[PDB]
Design a protein around this ligand. Structure first.
Ligand code: ZN
Length: 204
């Protein structure tokens, strides 16, 4: 499909910043039944389309009022980095909206009515942003539930190209306070796909 390319690439440089910001993930293992699982060796999340993908925010100090958390996908390969990551022709038309997310957006936030979605008028990139909340009573991190709404193999969309998700901790004006990122594969069996990739790594 003919969509305009972006004329920039968002920052990807990991940055803990003044608040010691970084991501964490559940240690879910590779059983066939897992719906989401993260590989630290590959810094790569494996997940199923539309299922809950918990991503943890860890900070050493609490950021100021009005702090926000933004997620955005970009292609990992340099020759595709200026192409906007978006849903494929089938999924952008299939009317699986939750009533909040634009039908073209790959990344949604589940379970948060305060969510905001952006089509950037200058860069054309899609992103989803929520208010930063500190950890709830009894927890040491903040958990956000993301959903990825196309498969990596969706033709006319990601078309088997790898992507990364960039998470930005922002002030109320959008200025960057911290940044982290991870690769994502959206697939039918995350547990087996993760184990197949990891068991074939070099044992150093
Ligand atoms: Zn799709």
């Amino acid at each position: 499909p003919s969509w305009p390319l972006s004329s920039s690439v968002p920052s990807q440089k990991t940055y803990q910043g003044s608040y010691g910001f970084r991501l964490g993930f559940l240690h879910s293992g590779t059983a066939k039944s897992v719906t989401c699982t993260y590989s630290p060796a590959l810094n790569k999340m494996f997940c199923q389309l539309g299922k809950t993908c918990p991503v943890q925010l860890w900070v050493d100090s609490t950021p100021p009022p009005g702090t926000r958390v933004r997620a955005m996908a970009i292609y990992k390969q340099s020759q595709h980095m200026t192409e906007v990551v978006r849903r494929c022709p089938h999924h952008e038309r299939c009317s699986d909206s939750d009533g909040l997310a634009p039908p073209q957006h790959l990344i949604r936030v589940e379970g948060n009515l305060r969510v905001e979605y952006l089509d950037d008028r200058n860069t054309f990139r899609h992103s989803v942003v929520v208010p930063y909340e500190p950890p709830e009573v009894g927890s040491d991190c903040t958990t956000i539930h993301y959903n990825y709404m196309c498969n990596s193999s969706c033709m006319g969309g990601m078309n088997r190209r790898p992507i990364k998700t960039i998470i930005r901790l922002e002030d109320s004006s959008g200025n960057l306070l911290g940044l982290d990122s991870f690769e994502v594969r959206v697939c039918a069996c995350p547990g087996r796909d993760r184990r197949t990739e990891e068991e074939n790594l070099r044992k150093k």
